[PDB]
Amino acid sequence: EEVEEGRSSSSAILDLPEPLLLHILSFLTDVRSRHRAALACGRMRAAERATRSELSLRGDPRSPGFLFLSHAFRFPALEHLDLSLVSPWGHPLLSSVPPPEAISEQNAFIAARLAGCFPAVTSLAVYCRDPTTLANLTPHWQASLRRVKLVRWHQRPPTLPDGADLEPLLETCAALRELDLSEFYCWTEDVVRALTTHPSATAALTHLDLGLAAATDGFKSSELGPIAASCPNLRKLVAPCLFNPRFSDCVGDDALLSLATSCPRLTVLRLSEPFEAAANIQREEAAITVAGLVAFFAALPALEDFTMDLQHNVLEAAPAMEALARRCPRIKFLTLGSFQGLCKASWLHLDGVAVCGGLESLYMKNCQDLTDASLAAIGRGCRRLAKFGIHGCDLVTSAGIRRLAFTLRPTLKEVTVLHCRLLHTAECLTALSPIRDRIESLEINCVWNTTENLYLGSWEMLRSLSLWFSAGQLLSPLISAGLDSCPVLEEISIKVEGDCRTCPRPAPRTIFGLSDLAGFPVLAKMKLDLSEAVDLSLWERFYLHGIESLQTLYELDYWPPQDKDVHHRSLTLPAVGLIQRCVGLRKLFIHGTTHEHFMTFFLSIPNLRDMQLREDYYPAPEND
Amino acid sequence: IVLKSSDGVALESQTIAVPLPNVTSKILAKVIEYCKRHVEADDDLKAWDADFMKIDQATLFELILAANYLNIKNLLDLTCQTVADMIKGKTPEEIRTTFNIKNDFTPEEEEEVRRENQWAFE
């Protein structure tokens, strides 16, 4: 009775009402899948362009290849537009500075064309070399530009007055609510001058990221004061601050309370201290006290994401964490640095951070009295812990990590164990056995014991892996340490620290061990960061040899080592050759420069597509 | 709650807020099974959605049209995400094969779509 059906002339997804085809394509967030979906038929192409929520412009909007495109190239519902990665990288886009009137009308035409394809931009990211970039761009989106992210890894123009970098946004974009200056270098005097002399646009800001490309020593109390007082509507603030009490203008107890009083509706606060290895401020005390933190935590009842990553220490912080649980019941994401006495766990109960039951993410840097008894009590009170991490804690053992992994089996999914003293790689991987089948992300520093490796289960849900090494150390003993079978591992991030002219040059014909990752089946994306790893070709061969053995290497971000006396991070000739042999690459991003032509990578790699020399360090070479 | 189908908790559908002449008796059996399982006050709750979505493509597209006439936002999004992940990672021809799509692009209209795609990073 039930016959099998044959060839059918109807397509169900095309017989759907077109609003429903738009709804389907709106969940497809993979860009390459969106591009392929627009090639299936003309109806899905209309669906892809009409529902694409974001886009990062690839190529040069100045070239005729963009200005003379059809109007079927039109994204009506596009919200976020990223004009940061426009080619050439780092060049001023739509600038008004000559390298007379012909450039004034060319900028208007390129802006009018960009307004055509994206006529509803509410979030804009752009490489802002000088403020005329914002002046020539905002006219078309000034009425709906809610969030703006500026990117400048270049030198600040020396003639610009204070605050000139942000004036075009504060004068024109009346819809501005979120300003992201995390990767936009400028003087701390710039942010203070502009945000305190524009009380009309500033009074509406709710998100502020003042990272300034990690090129400032932190905002002073005389600077964070007026900024907080001018933005009484901030809900999220991210900024480095000067916490060193050696300076009279540091951020202490009084600066914190004045920040919480001027911004009571804060829900996300991330203050950090710029690290500088020369000072070596390991145990030096900070101008912040536990008695002041309690009064500071009492003024932020809406606080949910707190991060105070310090280098100067804060002592007897156990009562402050208990006050954070009482005065801030919605706390969930806590990252603390150099906080001492975070959990005594002496009279049992749950003192310190264990009182904060609602914690979903906990991260602790440089806690010298965080012991196994603390991690035991932390696992009793923080039953909702989904992300856990300890950094620079020298009293935690594998028994504390293993107990926490067992008592937090249902919820713990991501673990960070960096530079802990009593925790080596092979011993720490064994401690995470209770969640070996559940952990999804892992970040560990690699320390080898020269007895049990070459010289077990399967991580069934581990998808992301982050590794920290030292100059001259090997990755090969990682397989012999416990990570011998990770089936669903798709991305890996590698970072190398330490000086180069002090580690003995490893015996030639040895390699770091990139080829030993071939046993990982679905390892696609890799982040190899060797920037802080210092003949230089000998050191790139050491770290890049064998990367061609990774058969499924899809996307690669490479950071070449810095130079002792040069501002360029050039790829040596053997470094280019070992990357050119990665035939499976789709995206290739070198965080530096190379003397080889950018097309040689496209000829050596058949399916290569996205390639760019993104020089995203603070002293950009300024190539023209 | 005495839900009369067309062949022969009932509140998740904001069109209910009875005769249902647009949904069959097989698709309404899956619609009711979806809302019964979700009226609960994690992983298990989300793991059942994938098991409930292990249906044939003919049944899936009837579920999409049902969760659109009926106003079940949580069901219309769950079934639409399934079709979106099907399109994910497939070549244009593979997308045509799964959904029986006919290539209606002229050799130049397809070349324009390709040329347009070269302006967005992946």
Instruction: Pick the closest to residue B65 from A19, A363, A178 (CA basis).
Output: A19
Q: Is B122 on the interface with A (CB under 8 A)?
A: yes
The answer to whether the CB atoms of B103 and A40 lie below 8 A apart is yes
Would you call B111 an interface residue with chain A, using a CB distance cutoff of 8 Å?
A: no
Contact A126, A84 (CB under 8 A): yes
Task: Return the exposure string of A269-285: e unless at least 16 CB atoms fall within 10 Å of the residue's CB, then b.
Answer: bbbbbbeeeeeebeeee
User: CB-CB: which of B81, B101, B121 is closest to A56?
Assistant: B121
Q: Residue A317: helix, strand or coil by DSSP?
A: coil
CB A388 within 8 A of CB A416: yes
The shortest CB-CB distance from B61 to any of A13, A30, A72 is to A13
Contacts of A599 (CB under 8 A, 6+ apart): none
Q: For chain B, what is the domain count?
A: 1
Q: Are the beta carbons of A440 and A463 closer than 8 angstroms?
A: yes
Burial class (CB in 10 A: 0-12, 13-18, 19+), A504: exposed
Q: What is the DSSP string of A335-363?
A: EEEEE--S---SSSTT-GGGG-TT-SEEE
* Cβ atoms of A405 and A382 closer than 8 Å: no
- Distance between CA atoms of B64 and B86, rounded to whole angstroms? 15
Resolution of the structure, angstroms? 3.2
The identity of residue A568, as a single letter, is H
Q: How far apart are CA A295 and CA A288, in angstroms?
A: 12
CA-CA-CA-CA dihedral for A199, A200, A206, A211, to nearest 10: -50
B35 touches chain A (CB under 8 A): no
| Residues in chain B closer than 8 A to A13 (CB atoms) | 61, 83, 99, 101
DSSP H helices in A461-560: 536-544
Smallest CA–CA distance from B85 into chain A, residue: A28
Q: What's the gap in Å between the CA of B11 and the closest CA on chain A?
A: 23
Distance of CA A580 to the CA centre of its chain: 27
Residue A135 located in a structural domain: no
Residues of B in contact with A4 (CB under 8 A): none
> Cα(A234)–Cα(A507) distance, rounded to whole angstroms?
56
Give the closest of A36, A57, A85 to B95, CB-based: A36
What distance in Å separates residue B18's CA from the closest CA in chain A? 25
Q: What does each C-alpha distance from A136 to A30, A62, A83, A108, A211 come to in angstroms?
A: 31, 14, 13, 7, 25
- Is B99 within 8 Å of A14 when comparing Cβ atoms? yes
- Distance (Å, whole) CA A75 – CA A572: 41
Alpha carbons B23 and B41: distance in angstroms, whole number: 28
Task: Tell me the β-bridge partners of A149.
Answer: A125, A180
Tell me the H-state helices in A448-535: none
Say if A591 falls within a structural domain.
yes
Q: Domain of A555?
A: 490-624
- Residues of chain A in contact with residue B92, where contact means CB-CB under 8 angstroms, are 36-37, 39-40
- B116 vs A56: CB contact, 8 Å cut-off? no
Q: Å from B90 to nearest chain A CA?
A: 7
Closest CA to A11 of B106, B26, B83: B83
Instruction: Name which of B76, B100, B122 is nearest A609 (Cβ-Cβ).
Output: B122
Which among A468, A357, A360, A356 has a CA at the least distance from the CA of A420? A468
Contact B121, A610 (CB under 8 A): yes
Tell whether A72 lies on the interface with B, counting CB pairs under 8 A.
Answer: yes
3-class DSSP state of A390: strand
| Out of A32, A41, A70, closest to residue B104 by CB | A41
> Strands, DSSP E only, in A258-346?
268-272, 305-314, 333-339
Work out whether the CA dihedral B69, B73, B78, B82 comes out positive or negative: positive
The answer to whether A12 contacts chain B (CB < 8 Å) is yes
Residues of A in contact with B68 (CB under 8 A): 17, 20
Q: Which domain holds residue B107?
A: 1-122
Cis preceding-peptide flag for A131 (omega within 30 of 0): no
Contact residues, chain B, for A43 at CB < 8 Å: 104
Asked if A610 has any chain B CB less than 8 Å from its own CB, the reply is yes
Q: Which residues, listed in sequence order, are joined to residue A148 by a DSSP beta bridge?
A: A124, A179
Contacts B73 to A, Cβ<8 Å: none
Is residue A485 within 8 Å of A456, Cβ to Cβ?
A: yes
Residue A163 lies in a domain: no
Closest CB to B113: pick one of A30, A45, A609.
A45
Experimental determination approach used = X-ray
- B55 inside 8 A of chain A by CB: no
Interface contact flag, A55 B120, Cβ < 8 Å: yes
Q: List chain A residues with CB under 8 Å of B78.
A: none
For tokens 């500075």, name the residue: A97
- A27 and B80 in contact by Cβ < 8 A? yes
DSSP H helical ranges for A39-125: 42-51, 64-67, 102-117
Q: Which of A8, A45, A66 sits opposite B100 (nearest CB)?
A: A8
A467 with A444: CB under 8 angstroms?
A: yes
Q: Is A261 exposed, middle or buried (0-12, 13-18, 19+ CB in 10 A)?
A: middle
| Mutation for testing the B interface, residue in A7, A35, A51, A552 having most B CBs under 10 Å | A35
- Please name the residues in contact with A187: beta carbons below 8 A apart, sequence gap of 6 or more: A156, A162, A216
Place of tokens 């690669």: A556
Question: Does A383 contact chain B (CB < 8 Å)?
Answer: no
Of A37, A58, A70, the CB nearest to B87: A37
Given an 8 Å threshold on Cβ–Cβ distance, is B87 in contact with A28? Answer: yes
**Cα separation, B7 vs B26, whole angstroms:** 9
Is A45 part of the contact surface with chain B (CB cutoff 8 Å)?
Answer: yes
Alpha carbon distance A280, A311 (integer Å): 9
Q: Mutate which of A39, A80, A589 to test chain B, going by most B C-beta atoms within 10 A?
A: A39
* Token duo for residue B27: 């698709």
Q: Is A78 exposed, middle or buried (0-12, 13-18, 19+ CB in 10 A)?
A: buried
The answer to whether B69 contacts chain A (CB < 8 Å) is no
Domains: count for chain A: 1
In a domain, A566, yes or no: yes
Cβ distance of A33 and B83 shorter than 8 Å:
no
A383 Cα to chain B: minimum distance (Å): 15
Separation in Å, CA of B17 to nearest CA in chain A:
22
List the structure tokens of B47. Answer: 């793991």
Answer whether A16 touches B (CB < 8 Å).
yes
Q: How many Å lie between the alpha carbon of B113 and the closest alpha carbon of chain A?
A: 7
Cβ pairs bridging A and B (under 8 Å):
123
Closest residue of A to B80, CA-based?
Answer: A24
Contacts of B75 in chain A (CB under 8 A): none
Q: A593 by DSSP, 3-state: which?
A: strand
CB-based contact B119 A58, cutoff 8 Å = yes
